Amino acid sequence: TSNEVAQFLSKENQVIVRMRGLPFTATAEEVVAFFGQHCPITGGKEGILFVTYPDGRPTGDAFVLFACEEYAQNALRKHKDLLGKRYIELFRSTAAEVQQVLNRFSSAPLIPL
């Protein structure tokens, strides 16, 4: 959702973490649970951007917002922890990379506003 992407990238002073390898059935609630209260996501479920194909099919990828560097460190320590049956690879990212990744899956490129 263009409004969803825009809302996600509008949050200032965030650290972005990329999730790779998610169960295709992964939900925002499960991602919140994966990080737990020691890595609170900015906006809760609203700080989670699932990367999807144009028809909404999942990719296995997501981005999440952390407001504090301590949260990002805690989060990165969960690299290869399980969500469901699958180990989750975690990487730091940036707004520019979020844009490039989203562009990989959309018919038209993102235009930031």
Author numbering: 312 to 424
From the paper:
Crystals that diffracted to 1.65A with space group P3121 were obtained for the ESRP1 qRRM2 domain complexed to a 12-mer RNA with sequence UGGUGGUGGUGG. The qRRM2 comprises four β-stands flanked by two alpha-helices at each side of the β-sheet. These helixes cover the beta-sheet region, making the qRRM domain different from canonical RRM domains, in which the RNA-binding region is located at the beta-sheet region, whereas the qRRM2 of ESRP1 binds to the RNA substrate through loop regions. The structure shows contacts with just three nucleotides of the RNA, with the sequence GGU binding within a double clamp arrangement. The three nucleotides are accommodated into a positively charged region, with two loop regions important for nucleotide binding, one of which is between β1 and α2 (Loop12 in Figure 5D) and another one between α3 and β4 (Loop34). The three nucleotide bases face down to Loop12 and Loop34, and the phosphate groups of the RNA are distal from the protein backbone, enhancing the sequence-specific RNA recognition by qRRM2. A close view of the interactions reveals that the two guanine residues are inserted into two clamps separated by Arg397 and form a π–π stacking like a sandwich. For G1 recognition, besides the stacking interactions from Arg397 and Phe335, the base of G1 is also specifically recognized through a number of hydrogen bonds. G2 is clamped by the side chain of Arg397 and Tyr398. Mutating each of the three important residues Phe335, Arg397 and Tyr398 to alanine resulted in the loss of RNA binding ability, and the R331A and E400A mutants showed dramatically decreased RNA binding affinity, consistent with the observations in the complex structure.
